[PDB]
Structure formats: C-alpha cells, structure tokens
C-alpha cells in the first residue's frame, strides 16, 4: 500500500480523488469499469466481466452516461434538466462510483444506489445522486452503479442469445458482483450491502430480490416509489418480441429472422434507435415505456405474482415507501389540459381523456369503473378535483397500489418491513404547485442536498434530510431504521396485521395504517377481476 486514494482491487489498481464535503473531505473513486464495453457485436448481449488491467486506473472523474432519449420539453429549465445526462453519452457506459469516508474505514456498511428513469434513461452522475453527503454524514461506503437502458438494455427477442432481454438488469447484477468481490478493499463490508433505488431503480431492487441469480449479492433493500410488479416495469416475451420487431420495422430492417433483425439493429447508430423508440408502444398511453424487463423464465423463473404468492424470493428486511403525488409528472408531460405554467384545472372532457390514457389496457366498463371511483358526483365540474383526481389515478395505478400489493405479499414471508409516505413539498421546488410532492423529489432528501446552504432549503428541510439519511443508513447497517435505545419517535415495523406506516415530513412523526386501502382494493382486487371477466 501507499496512499488513501490508491486501492488495489481484484481487477487492478484504482486512483481516486479527494473531494470537499461540508467543510471536510472524503475520497471518491469515479468511473470504475465493471464490465467490458457492450459495443459492436456485443450490443444487446449479456454483459461480460471487465478484463483486469495493468497500471493504475484513473478514477478521478465521472464516466460517460449510457445512450438515452434526452428530455427537451423545457430547454434550460432546471426541473427537467436535473434528470438529463450531464456527461457525454456513449454505449461504453458500464461504470460505477464509490464515495469512501476518510480515514478509509475497515469494514463498514455499504449502500449501492440504482438510478431510475423508466428503464429508458438515467445516469449515476447526476447532481442529485452525489453520494458524498451521505457517505460523509453517515459514514457508509456509497456506491452508484450504471446499466444499459432503452433498447440497448432491454430489447428482447426471447429464444435468441444475441438479444435475450433483461441485459440491463444483468449489468446491474454484474456491478453488484463486482461490489461483492471488491468493496472490501475500499473499507466496505460485503456482508452488509444494501441496494436502494427509486422508481425504475426501486422496481430493479425488487427484481433482484425476486431473481434467484441476484439474491446472494446483497443483504438488505430499500425501494423508493417503485415495485417489481409495477404495470410499466415488465412485459411478456411475446410483447417484448412484438416491440423489437416493430423497432426493426421503423428502421427498415430485414425481419425474416432474429439474426437478420439483430444484425440490422446492430449496424444502426445509437441515435437512430433512440429516434424511433417511442413508436413501438401498443397503446396511446402515459406511464408506459418501450423497452423494459421481460418475464423470461430465466432472470424471473415464473410470473412475478406466483413468485410473490409462493415466497419465491429473498427473505430479508426492506424499507420502502411512496410520495404523495406520484402521477403529476406524467400528466404534465402527456395528458391534455396540463401545462407547466398554469394551475391546470381539468375539464370533464379532459378528465375522460386522461383516464383513457392512464389505463390503456382497460375496456369501456373498466374505464367507467375508474371514472366512478374517482369522481365526486356532487361536484363533477370542479377543475381542481378533476386535476387532483387524475393525479391520484396515475399514482395509485402505477406506483402506490402496486407497491402496496408487493408490501403485503412480501411481509408474509419477510424478516422486517418499514413503510413510509413522503409528503413534504420542498420550499425551493421549481415545478408548479399543482404538481405537489412529485415522483423523484424525495431523492434530494435521501442524498442530503438540503445540508448544502447554497441550495436554499429551510433549516427544517435540513433536519428532515438528516433524519431520512440516518433512517436509511441505520436500516442499511442493522435492518432497522431506528437507533437502538434512542429517545426519538419510533418508526413502527409494518406487520401483516396492523399494516403501520409513517409520514415523512417536517412535522412530528405520525403513524397511520393501511396506506390508501380503499383505492388499492379497487386497483389490486376489483378492477383486474372486472377486466378478466369482461
């Protein structure tokens, strides 16, 4: 050995950089490769481990971000820009980042972050994912991995070994394998690794809990506004095939064989695939993405529901929850009547249009059922009630109720469940008020941005961030978010019987029960029975 910033791993030596953090410093090892570049003939293929290298790998700067659709709806607006790639895009994008406390610990709790982005976008390098605050404040080794998204990570032609599907999930698994095998050299304890992620990242976490091939690579899990059984998080192999073929058709490919199709798709430049990616969806919809995980019978042995029902999944502790207004982000971008600069009061006709877009797979009776369930017939033309009702429909159907179904099924076999409901609207949010507590906006509290004065949060928002970070890190470390022997209010364990959860905000803790049961019994029990019968 020789330096705090020099670490020798089983793949080779790596040189980090010292980084300033809240008046102190820590080490950062950025852009460490964990797989061979998935380029050329390797596009769509399972990832291959990175060949060890001679010399010192320079890990002082962020890596490229994977090829992805870029949001240009509000050019320059920080609200949407904060999610876009902040590094050059490239198919050579399989890297991970590690923030290590200083002095380098010996065997401390490890947290691995899996970014979201609907499986079609996302980056490990975003300012909101800067792991130095959490690593520094809670003294954990914080890792953020990356994985292929869009067609590159999820194009699926089941049966072929050239584009089997789920390779983006396999990229994540390879990074977890690299962490298992090498994090000890950075002072992390590979026996105490917690994977956590948001939205598609949270669904990913749940997928690794389910997939037998991933279970052994981590200890505990945290899922933020995402669940493996979300209606948008996976497709059948038949639907995946249908979309891969349709993509081919959009690029004038030869469709006579998987081989012809894949070869053609492999000759296209990245942007050519991204330019027609949205043309393959089966319905006019919102909260539906083209290339996502496939129930292949390999990564996922059987249907997610049967795995959940039989307990065919990793049994450990989990901490998860949702935000109050999960649907607003999606309505703003794709439902008629909504806009960034107006209060977006929704007419009755636009409500109807929104319902249709929100539950694309529903027949007319189904649409009537949804509409009835969310319409106040004493005040049906209330623009605000219609706007908020759509917000709830999108959020309940796509995030909350799927998570609540997962929570209840998991808890029957698990070793500990902690549930939260994040409902604090940040004081400095740039999005309009009508959007409320937006999908993805608890992340900045989990990563400690509020402790940064220049970001302009309130003192109570800093207090909230510290509490959340300490809950997350204590759970990662012990399997319980609560400090043993503490005097603070206790976050109750969610049990099959009591189903307790806590609100997460700047007010004194408050415990509740049966998070949105009324609506979720409709989404998880009644509606699917209706659609299957009719």
Ligand X SMILES: COc1ccc2c3c1O[C@H]1C[C@@H](O)C=C[C@@]31CCN(CCCN1CCCCC1)C2
Ligand Y SMILES: *[C@@H]1O[C@H](CO)[C@@H](O[C@@H]2O[C@H](CO)[C@@H](O)[C@H](O)[C@H]2NC(C)=O)[C@H](O)[C@H]1NC(C)=O
Judge whether 199 counts as a catalytic residue. yes
Binding site partner of 377, from a second copy, ligand X, ligand NAG, none, Cβ cut-off 5-8 A by kind: a second copy
Is residue 428 close enough to count as binding ligand Y by CB under 6 A? no
State which residue, 29 or 115, has the beta carbon closest to ligand NAG: 29
Instruction: Locate 206 and state its tokens.
Output: 């749940």
Alpha-carbon distance 276 to 173, whole Å?
28
Is residue 440 close enough to count as binding ligand X by CB under 6 A? yes
SS3 420: strand
Q: Which of 15, 37, 62, 71 binds ligand X (CB under 6 A)?
A: 71
DSSP classification of residue 398: I
Residue 37's alpha-carbon distances to 11, 59, 90, 367, in angstroms, are 15, 17, 10, 46
Residue 141's alpha-carbon distances to 300, 319, 405, 531, in angstroms, are 30, 19, 32, 47
Is residue 118 close enough to count as binding ligand X by CB under 6 A? yes
Alpha-carbon distance 241 to 156, whole Å?
6
Long-range contacts at 39-45 (CB < 8 A, ≥ 24 apart): 39/91, 39/92, 40/266, 41/266, 43/91, 43/152, 43/265, 43/266, 44/151, 44/152, 44/155, 44/162, 44/163, 44/167, 44/262, 44/265, 44/266, 45/162, 45/163, 45/167
Binding site partner of 61, from a second copy, ligand NAG, ligand Y, none, Cβ cut-off 5-8 A by kind: ligand NAG
Smallest gap from residue 58 Cβ to ligand NAG (A): 4
CB 373 within 8 A of CB 522: yes
CB 205 within 8 A of CB 114: yes
What residues make contact with a second copy under the rule CB under 8 A? 365, 368-369, 372, 376-378, 513-514, 517-518, 521-522, 525-526, 529-530, 533-534
Q: Which of 42, 60, 249, 470 binds ligand NAG (CB under 6 A)?
A: 60
First to last CA, the chain: 69
Q: Which of 150, 293, 416, 448 binds ligand Y (CB under 6 A)?
A: 416
> Shortest Cβ contact with ligand X: which residue?
116
Considering 11, 91, 439, 465, which one is annotated as catalytic? 439
Binding site partner of 533, from ligand X, ligand Y, a second copy, none, Cβ cut-off 5-8 A by kind: a second copy
Binding part of the chain for ligand NAG, among 54-62, 138-146, 333-341, 500-508 by CB under 6 A, reads: 54-62
Binding part of the chain for ligand X, among 38-46, 111-119, 170-178, 453-461 by CB under 6 A, reads: 111-119
Considering 162, 277, 326, 444, which one is annotated as catalytic? 326
Instruction: Locate 420 and state its tokens.
Output: 């939260």
Instruction: Locate 479 and state its tokens.
Output: 């399997």
Smallest gap from residue 373 Cβ to a second copy (A): 9
Q: Which residues are catalytic?
A: 199, 326, 439
Binding site for ligand Y (CB under 6 A): 415-416
Residues contributing to the site for ligand X (CB under 6 A) = 71, 83, 116-118, 121-122, 198-200, 329-330, 333, 439-440
């Amino acid at each position: 050995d020789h330096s705090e910033l020099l670490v020798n791993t089983k793949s080779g030596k790596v040189m980090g950089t010292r980084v300033p953090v809240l008046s102190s410093h820590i080490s950062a090892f950025l852009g460490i490769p964990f797989a061979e570049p998935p380029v050329g003939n390797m596009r769509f293929r399972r990832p291959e481990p990175k060949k060890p290298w001679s010399g010192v790998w320079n890990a002082s700067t962020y890596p490229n971000n994977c090829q992805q659709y870029v949001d240009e709806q509000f050019p320059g607006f920080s609200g949407s820009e904060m999610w876009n790639p902040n590094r050059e895009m490239s198919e050579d994008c399989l890297y991970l980042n590690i923030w290590v406390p200083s002095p380098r610990p010996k065997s401390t709790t490890v947290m691995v972050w899996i970014y979201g982005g609907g499986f079609y976008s996302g980056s490990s390098t975003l300012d909101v994912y800067n792991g130095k605050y959490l690593a520094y404040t809670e003294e954990v080794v914080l890792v953020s991995l990356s994985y292929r998204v869009g067609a590159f990570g999820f194009l699926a032609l089941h049966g072929s070994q050239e584009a089997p599907g789920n390779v983006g999930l396999l990229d994540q698994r390879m990074a977890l394998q690299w962490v298992h095998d090498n994090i000890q050299f950075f002072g992390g304890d590979p026996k105490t690794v917690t994977i956590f992620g948001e939205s598609a990242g949270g669904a990913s976490v749940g997928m690794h809990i389910l997939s037998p091939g991933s279970r052994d690579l981590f200890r505990r899990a945290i899922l933020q506004s995402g669940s493996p059984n979300c209606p948008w998080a996976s497709v059948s192999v038949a639907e995946g095939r249908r979309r891969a073929v349709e993509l081919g058709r959009n690029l004038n490919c030869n469709l006579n064989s998987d081989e012809e199709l894949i070869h053609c798709l492999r000759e296209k430049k990245p942007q050519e695939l991204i330019d027609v990616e949205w043309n393959v969806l089966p319905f006019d919809s919102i909260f539906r993405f083209s290339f996502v995980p496939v129930i292949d019978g390999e990564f996922f042995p059987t249907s997610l529901e049967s795995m959940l029902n039989s307990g065919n999944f990793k049994k450990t502790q989990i901490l998860l929850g949702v935000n109050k207004d999960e649907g607003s982000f999606f309505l703003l971008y794709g439902a008629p009547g909504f806009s960034k600069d107006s209060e977006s009061k929704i007419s009755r006709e636009d409500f109807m249009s929104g319902v249709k877009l929100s539950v694309p797979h529903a027949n007319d009776l189904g649409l009537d059922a949804v509409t009835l369930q969310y319409t106040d017939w004493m005040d049906d033309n209330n623009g605000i009630k219609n706007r908020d009702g759509l917000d709830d429909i999108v959020g309940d159907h796509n995030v909350i109720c799927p998570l609540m179904h997962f929570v209840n099924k998991y808890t029957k076999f698990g070793n500990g469940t902690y549930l939260y409901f994040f409902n604090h609207r940040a004081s400095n949010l740039v999005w309009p008020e009508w959007m409320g507590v937006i999908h993805g906006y608890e992340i900045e509290f989990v990563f400690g941005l509020p402790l940064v004065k220049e970001l302009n949060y309130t003192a109570e928002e800093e207090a909230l961030s510290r509490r959340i970070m300490h809950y997350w890190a204590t759970f990662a470390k012990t399997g319980n978010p609560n400090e043993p022997h503490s005097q603070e209010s206790k976050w109750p364990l969610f049990t099959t019987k009591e189903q307790k959860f806590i609100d997460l905000n700047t007010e004194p803790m408050k415990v509740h029960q049966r998070l949105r049961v009324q609506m979720c019994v409709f989404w998880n029990q009644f509606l699917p029975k209706l659609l299957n019968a009719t």
